[PDB]
Amino acid sequence: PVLRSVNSREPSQVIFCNRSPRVVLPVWLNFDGEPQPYPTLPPGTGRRIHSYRGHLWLFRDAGTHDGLLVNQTELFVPSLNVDGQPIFANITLPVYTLKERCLQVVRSLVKPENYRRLDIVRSLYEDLEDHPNVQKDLERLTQERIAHQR
């Protein structure tokens, strides 16, 4: 799998900083490129982490899996600490499209089995049902990865 951590065994001290208004779920892609969840971060809190050089991390809203960014990008990769200097992973919200943002709010209020009782244009029912998914994201980042490598 193109997207996966490397078993470097080279320790890297990282500090997750949840600079977002969401409960953050840090996801670690193991050696087989499989998503593994870790302890969530409450809004505006930070936490020290013992990771390793070459490991991959991504972050999502713990309860909805809405996509989030780390240091402005999709993936975070620990590097060797330079002079005991910890590596920062600043988690923030991305600028969602107005539509995606509205979809989030609606999903957070209406139970899936009720989406279709809403008085909105048909097409939007499917958009609501198609909630963010980490697996699909990986597949997407994978193909985006392949394009950026011609």
Partner: peptide, 18 residues
């Protein structure tokens, strides 16, 4: 042995921006 990430288990801290 494949070493996976782990949490030192310390006191989380507030980010002053909040």
């Amino acid at each position: 042995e494949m070493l996976a990430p782990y949490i030192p288990m310390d006191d989380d801290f507030q980010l002053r921006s909040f």
